[PDB]
Amino acid sequence: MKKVEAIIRPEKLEIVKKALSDAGYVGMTVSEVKGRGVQGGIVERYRGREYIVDLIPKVKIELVVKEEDVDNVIDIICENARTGNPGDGKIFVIPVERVVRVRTKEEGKEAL
Amino acid sequence: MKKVEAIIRPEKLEIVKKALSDAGYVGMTVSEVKGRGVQGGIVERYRGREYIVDLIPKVKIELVVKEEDVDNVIDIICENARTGNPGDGKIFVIPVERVVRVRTKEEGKEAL
Amino acid sequence: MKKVEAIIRPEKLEIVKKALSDAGYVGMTVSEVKGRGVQGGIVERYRGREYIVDLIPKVKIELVVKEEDVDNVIDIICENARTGNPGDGKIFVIPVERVVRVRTKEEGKEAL
Ligand SMILES: Nc1ncnc2c1ncn2[C@@H]1O[C@H](COP(=O)(O)OP(=O)(O)OP(=O)(O)O)[C@@H](O)[C@H]1O
Ligand SMILES: Nc1ncnc2c1ncn2[C@@H]1O[C@H](COP(=O)(O)OP(=O)(O)OP(=O)(O)O)[C@@H](O)[C@H]1O
Ligand SMILES: Nc1ncnc2c1ncn2[C@@H]1O[C@H](COP(=O)(O)OP(=O)(O)OP(=O)(O)O)[C@@H](O)[C@H]1O
Ligand SMILES: O=C(O)CCC(=O)C(=O)O
Ligand SMILES: O=C(O)CCC(=O)C(=O)O
Ligand SMILES: O=C(O)CCC(=O)C(=O)O
Ligand SMILES: [Mg+2]
Ligand SMILES: [Mg+2]
Ligand SMILES: [Mg+2]
């Protein structure tokens, strides 16, 4: 099992989660975050002066899935989250050693 | 060292954190999140029409602990977070390779 | 690749992120959290009575970096986040097995 952690534009949550759900990837945790990447933020202008805004709102989605499904999850996220402009997102894959469903104490792949 | 990441009902935070603390599991980070599991959300009715609400508020708790304590932490969370209805929670165990206390630069088990 | 996850005082975000950026560590995700450590919270007094506040606001910063840079990232965070009083922060290092830039589908170290 692996956690796919993707930080994406807030306005892309709806299309990404629909595309994931349609492909069978339903279990997901969503968090509001702020961040920056390589570019260090965005340049804005106020009264003729340019300045850097160095933290931008994003949404973090976390999906724990079987390892064999990671490629497809990443492909779906990238296809649907992309706009072509810097800031479209970053994905990390993090190992998950155990998964437990609280209600039933099921573990493993059936507990996803 | 392992991170126990549990996503549970918001109204179960108090009883879960009390039970963990009573058993000696104190260090914890709490985050407000939204999510869905297998069921894909909840069915609601508005003016006779049923629709799906596909993200539900939850609370994420993260406890970094010694590996030997993971079983007990999971047992405590499940016992106290359960209600018997879908949505009671999901737990992931994620490896933690290093722990550092900022104030003192202590590392390892004593830094938990 | 490794995720450095640091939970620090909210009022230290600015100096920590500036120091990290100055040293070349730019990519970062920031989350608002609450937590407690060893001390279990803070003692407060209201109308002569002392009570425990057991969750304190903090900021979580997450930086995914090359393994060889983890030591330096931790050193920078600790130097700039410390005040000398309990609550200055906790850092966890979590393995990251894959990194993908959404816009370009780049992976690996160049996608950081
Ligand atoms: N190395 C990293 N560590 C932590 N979070 C990161 C990192 N890289 C990016 N992020 C998070 O991902 C979000 C989106 O990053 P972003 O798309 O800007 O990446 P990028 O590498 O700059 O690529 P692009 O050139 O397409 O902008 C950031 O706002 C931040 O929350
Ligand atoms: N595979 C998963 N990946 C990411 N987060 C998940 C996943 N499964 C569940 N979650 C998170 O855990 C929360 C609680 O899940 P939930 O209890 O509904 O799990 P479930 O597998 O549907 O079990 P149940 O049948 O008891 O509802 C979700 O709202 C979501 O935040
Ligand atoms: N073992 C842990 N698991 C989860 N989160 C933790 C843990 N230890 C600390 N944290 C998080 O880090 C924050 C800061 O912790 P803190 O600085 O109080 O650590 P500490 O071990 O008590 O050290 P100090 O004695 O310097 O206070 C907490 O409020 C919490 O969010
Ligand atoms: O996040 C944005 O929308 C643009 C800024 C960006 O790509 C960054 O800081 O890396
Ligand atoms: O989270 C709820 O309370 C019920 C909905 C649920 O279990 C889910 O989407 O998996
Ligand atoms: O977080 C604080 O500022 C002090 C309380 C503390 O260190 C703790 O609960 O461990
Ligand atoms: Mg960018
Ligand atoms: Mg469910
Ligand atoms: Mg403390």
Author numbering:
A (entry chain A), B (entry chain A), C (entry chain A): 1 to 112
What does the report in the manuscript say about this coordinate set?
PII-family proteins are key players in the regulation of nitrogen metabolism in bacteria, archaea and in the plastids of plant/algae. All PII proteins known so far show a typical homotrimeric organization. The monomeric unit, of circa 11–18 kDa, consists of two α-helices, four β-strands (organized in a double ferredoxin-like fold β1α1β2β3α2β4) and three protruding loops called B, C and T. In the trimeric state, clefts are formed at the dimeric interface through the interaction of the B-loop and the base of the T-loop of one subunit with the C-loop of the adjacent one. These clefts constitute the binding site for ADP/ATP, magnesium (Mg) and 2OG.
To evaluate the C-terminal extension’s effect on ligand binding, MjGlnK1 was produced and crystallized without a tag. Both structures show an almost identical coordination of the ligands. In MjGlnK1woT, the carboxy-terminus is coordinating the adenine ring and the Lys90, the latter adequately engages a salt bridge with the β-phosphate of the ATP. The carboxy-terminus is itself locked by the side chain of the Ile via hydrophobic interaction. Moreover, the addition of the poly-histidine tag displaces the Mg which cannot bind the 2OG anymore.
